[model samples]
Target: RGKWTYNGITYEGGGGGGGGSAAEAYAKRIAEAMAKG
Candidate 1:
């Protein structure tokens, strides 16, 4: 969990950051993290 927690933060977007504008993508990978068991 914490593995990808910092995983999402390390991405400052090298230019393709034109997505949600923030940690918008990590919103669900968390689901696969905690409940992924």
Candidate 2:
């Protein structure tokens, strides 16, 4: 049983964040919840 060596690649597909779109959505939800309470 000698078969285990294959996992490598270049990933430059924006590994930063969700492009801020998610930030606004999540922030809005929190803001609304706080405002409601």
Candidate 3:
């Protein structure tokens, strides 16, 4: 599992559970699309 703190909030993810990968993947795609201009 992976844990990190952002803006005073803690997030736990990894290890085949918690749906974090899905969210992170979506965000990456969105960021890429926006960067393409």
TM-scores, one per candidate: 0.28, 0.36, 0.36
RMSD of each candidate relative to the true structure: 7.5, 14.9, 6.4
Q: TM-score rank, highest first?
A: 2, 3, 1
Position 1, candidate 3: lDDT? 31
Give the better candidate number (2 or 3) by TM-score: 2
Per-candidate local distance difference test: 0.50, 0.53, 0.64
Q: How high is the lDDT of residue 1 in model 1? A: 17
Off by over 4 Å in 3: 1-19
Off by over 4 Å in 1: 1-24
- On lDDT, the stronger of 2 and 3 is 3
Candidate with more favorable, higher TM-score: 1 or 2: 2
Candidate 3 residue-wise lDDT, 1-37, digit = tens: 3575779988765334555578667764776689776
lDDT tens digits, residues 1-37, model 2?
1233447654453324556667656774776689764
